[PDB]
């Protein structure tokens, strides 16, 4: 439900206030049962996540255990690998920036705890190029850990071998995709591959590979070291566990709090963070999972709590759980319009739907903000939207269509008036 206890808050060093470095980490006791866990077995680790029923902490939601289970199949003579994507291009995902800037070890032991679960030879962490600062913090942390012998061959005084590496991103949101990151590592252009060859079977350097949101890798060790069931209790049904929530825009105290999942949307701005700037009635709309997920208008805001099942009932996605809030002084139409501008400046262009479709919606959306376009065009953008939604090679085209669909779904009268406003002044 809500009011996650500090005693249950995984990322204790959030907000810093501790030594993100190892000695702070030791007081955190992050490396407490690592040898034991690995000793227990890879099968024991996946039992822990299956019991946890953790969902993907990245924009896509899938059982974390089943995804890791897939490349637990016997090696075919190719080294298995771990890829941690610290890229978070999605607006409002400062969620991950926290775990690299702070509590970097949380992720380092997440990597080896996760590594033996998939039997990965090594893990590469792709941080956003922008986070040069963040990249500096982690390898200082990674360097500490090996010096200790926590990672490396015979890591944590155990038979198992692991090596952790950090890879420089280069300002691309699409590099965040499950497969495209792999291609970026491989050194080719960051263009996603098709799903038929699933990442596990075909991978980074053509070997089995798996990709996890940094939050997903980070919570593993604590979910196993601590009781996974313990975590499970926090979640709701399929939904489970605490996921960091970032609230940004039109709220009195924008902040990232790792409060519990399944939180009433009205409650998290009202109780933690900062109540919606201007009052809870000054809420034109809420973007729950970030730019990719459709915004939900106030009417439904207070009604649904934050969890992926509840949101999909609501037609929106928990995604990165980045809450972007809009007051009534905003231009709903120009707000979403810049997100389509966010996607035309960013989609790879590999696939026909997304390439021309996202540019086509950008042109129509800019006209919509001006009000130059006629009212009949508004549903035509509906139809352009679903052509892009099911036909794209990756999910970004999936993502571009949803905000457009949300604007037409709940704010169709406002766009018509902008249509009307321009027609009147001629």
């Amino acid at each position: 439900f809500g009011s996650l206890k500090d005693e249950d808050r995984i990322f204790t060093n959030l907000y810093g206030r501790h030594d993100w470095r190892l000695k702070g980490a030791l007081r955190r006791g992050d490396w407490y049962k690592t040898k034991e866990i690995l000793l227990k077995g890879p099968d024991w680790i996946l039992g822990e996540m299956k019991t946890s029923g953790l969902r993907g902490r990245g924009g896509a939601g899938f059982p974390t255990g089943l995804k890791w289970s897939f490349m637990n199949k016997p090696s075919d003579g190719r080294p298995k690998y771990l890829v941690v994507n610290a890229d978070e291009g999605e607006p409002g995902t400062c969620k991950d920036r926290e775990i690299m800037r702070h509590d970097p070890h949380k992720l380092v032991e997440g990597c080896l705890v996760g590594g033996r679960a998939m039997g990965a030879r090594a893990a590469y962490i792709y941080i956003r190029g922008e986070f040069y600062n963040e990249a500096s913090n982690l390898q200082v942390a990674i360097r500490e850990a090996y010096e200790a012998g926590l990672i490396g061959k015979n890591a944590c005084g155990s038979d198992y071998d692991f090596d952790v590496f950090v890879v420089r991103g280069a300002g691309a949101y699409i590099c965040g995709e499950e497969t495209a990151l792999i291609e970026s590592i491989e050194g080719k252009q960051g263009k996603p591959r098709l799903k038929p060859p699933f990442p596990a079977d075909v991978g980074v350097f053509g070997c089995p590979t798996t990709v996890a949101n940094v939050e997903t890798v980070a919570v593993s060790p604590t979910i196993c070291r601590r009781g996974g069931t313990w975590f499970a209790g926090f979640g709701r049904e399929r939904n489970s566990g605490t996921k960091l929530f970032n609230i940004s825009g039109h709220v009195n105290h924008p902040c990232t709090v790792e409060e519990e999942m399944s939180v009433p949307l009205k409650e998290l701005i009202e109780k933690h963070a900062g109540g919606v700037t201007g009052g809870w009635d000054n809420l034109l709309a809420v973007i729950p999972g970030g730019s990719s997920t459709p915004l939900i208008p106030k009417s439904v805001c207070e009604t649904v709590l934050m969890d992926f099942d509840a949101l999909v009932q609501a037609q929106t996605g928990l995604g990165t759980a980045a809450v972007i809030v809009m007051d009534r002084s905003t231009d709903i139409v120009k707000a979403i319009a810049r997100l389509i501008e966010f996607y035309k400046h960013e989609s790879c262009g590999q696939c026909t739907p997304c390439r021309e479709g996202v540019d086509w919606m950008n042109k129509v959306m800019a006209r919509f903000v001006k009000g130059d376009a006629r009212p009949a065009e508004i549903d035509s953008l509906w139809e352009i939207s679903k052509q892009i939604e099911g036909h794209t090679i990756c999910a970004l085209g999936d993502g571009a269509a949803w905000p457009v669909q949300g604007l037409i779904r709940h704010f169709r009268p406002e766009l018509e008036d902008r249509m009307q406003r321009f027609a009147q002044q001629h």
């Binding site: 996650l4 500090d6 005693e7 808050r9 204790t12 907000y15 501790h18 030791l26 955190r28 006791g29 407490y32 049962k33 034991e36 227990k40 024991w44 607006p91 400062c94 991950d96 920036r97 926290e98 800037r101 956003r128 190029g129 922008e130 600062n133 590496f165 890879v167 420089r168 991103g169 280069a170 300002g171 691309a172 949101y173 590592i185 491989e186 050194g187 080719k188 350097f205 196993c224 070291r225 069931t229 970032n246 940004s248 825009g249 039109h250 009195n252 105290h253 924008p254 902040c255 709090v257 790792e258 409060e259 933690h272 963070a273 900062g274 972007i324 979403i336 810049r338 997100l339 966010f342």
Partner: protein
């Protein structure tokens, strides 16, 4: 996306990794599996950018040589990513985040202030070559929606006057306290932490026999 050879930006310019740089080069390679030096392109191309911001056609060709890859390969990587600059950026490259999260926090409000202070249009270098302003997209520090990235400095919660203090510090002197401004630090509920105030539970706590 076409490199029309120009006396300044052309193959004529000689590029070569400093003895120190070449060293760095190798370090990167080994990170990748053997015989996969190809992957070194992005990281290496980045060090060519570290060497020189311009990174001219000559520099890319050099990268191809070092990693043994086909030049077109490197050319494709440089063009795809915004991080690499194929034109001479200014000494201080100021990038203002203007995605919706920041906009709603008047990120644009920052823009107008910076254009006037630099006294220049958005997208080009100052005559002084001192600063270069560009309207970049989300930088991943939405919590502090007002935000500008100055050569990694990554400042935040910036207000016209805040940027004012910052731009003056860059123009005279250096290292202008890069980071947030209001003192909200990184993602602190401004009013109060409201959480994590309780002391760390300590190692062992909650193990619950896993």
């Amino acid at each position: 996306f076409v490199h029309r050879d120009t006396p300044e930006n052309n193959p004529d310019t000689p590029f070569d990794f400093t003895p120190e740089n070449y060293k760095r080069i190798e370090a990167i390679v080994k990170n990748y599996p053997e015989g996969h030096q190809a992957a070194a392109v992005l990281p290496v191309l980045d060090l060519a950018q570290r060497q020189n911001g311009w990174l001219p056609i000559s520099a890319m060709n050099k990268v191809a040589e070092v990693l043994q890859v086909p030049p077109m390969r490197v050319y494709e990587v440089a063009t795809f990513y915004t991080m690499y600059n194929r034109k001479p950026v200014g000494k201080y490259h100021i990038q203002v985040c203007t995605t919706t999260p920041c906009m709603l926090r008047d990120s644009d409000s920052i823009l107008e202030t910076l254009q006037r202070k630099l006294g220049i249009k958005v997208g080009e270098t100052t005559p002084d070559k001192l600063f270069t302003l560009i309207e970049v997209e989300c930088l991943g520090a939405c919590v502090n929606a007002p935000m500008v990235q100055i050569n990694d400095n990554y400042y935040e919660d910036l207000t016209p006057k805040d940027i004012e203090e910052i731009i003056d510090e860059l123009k005279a002197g250096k290292v202008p306290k890069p980071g947030p401004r209001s003192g909200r630090f990184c993602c602190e509920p401004a009013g109060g932490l409201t959480s994590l105030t309780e002391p760390p539970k300590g190692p062992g706590f909650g193990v619950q026999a896993g």
